Amino acid sequence: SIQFTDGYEVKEDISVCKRCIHKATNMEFAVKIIDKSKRDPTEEIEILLRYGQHPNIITLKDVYDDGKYVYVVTELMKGGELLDKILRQKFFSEREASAVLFTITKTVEYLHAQGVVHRDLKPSNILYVDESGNPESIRICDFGFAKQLRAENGLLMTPCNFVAPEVLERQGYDAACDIWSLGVLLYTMLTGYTPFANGPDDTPEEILARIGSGKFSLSGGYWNSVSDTAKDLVSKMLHVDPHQRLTAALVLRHPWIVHWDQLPQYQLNRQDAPHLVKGAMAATYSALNR
Ligand SMILES: COC(=O)CCC(=O)OC
Ligand SMILES: COC(=O)CCC(=O)OC
Ligand code: NA
């Protein structure tokens, strides 16, 4: 009945994502406009409906379906990408890096336990809702690739009936891939450069050759100022073998997360090239998805 046009005014582009105005309040929101002939966003909407009330998951405000497009209205992120803000802070410290990773990983731990893998958890999908710089303002966004574990009969399941074994191991693989991207995030927060790519021009083959070799530098340079506890966690999040990589639950038990209050609060020594990083990250995830 009531359409999206009726309660909202559409504004500039930000699937297609636009800014909009709720007419009764003049508050502003984001709407993701989804072409039903391209893809079925039932999964994405079910996940946002069930789980968007989490303080650190993007919150769903309104949904409409006109038969062509689905309109998914959410809070509008006004604080930009997390990594963009953090890489431009000269005085950022491991203690702040740990508070950020804690907030994010606690959210991922909750999702995985509810049977949800994100599958697109790159840094540019992790944003700040406002400019406060507070970890509470973090939001994980874009669940367009996420998946709920289900049984054969359609019944929502949690990893703790009958689910096909290859649905389970694939879910396991997907959850590990989620943690690996949080590893990429951590590495980059600590040093100002990404682990597998130097810039947007790195070839996909060389990025994948680095990923597949399971090796990345944890010593020297920007890493001289960084604690062993941090390096240890990074190494266990980026481990190339998903069977050996930490889970979200184990990340939260690492002393770098638990003992944050013993972490150095002096400034990290980092590359300052946030725009280079952005292109290196895009190159890294392009190589991955192919
Ligand atoms: C309402 O959803 C959007 O505005 C799409 C963009 C996005 O979520 O990027 C992280
Ligand atoms: C299929 O993609 C993934 O498994 C992402 C994580 C990963 O590449 O670890 C090496
Ligand atoms: Na939320």
Author numbering: 415 to 428, 434 to 579, 583 to 712
Give sentences from the paper.
We determined the structure of RSK2CTKD co-crystallized with excess DMF at 1.9 Å resolution by X-ray crystallography. Hydrophobic interactions are furthermore formed with I633 and L710 of αG and αL, respectively. On the other hand, access to C579 in the activation loop was blocked by a crystal contact and therefore remained unaccounted for from the crystal structure analysis.
The linker region is phosphorylated by the activated CTKD, and hereby activates the NTKD for phosphorylation of downstream targets.
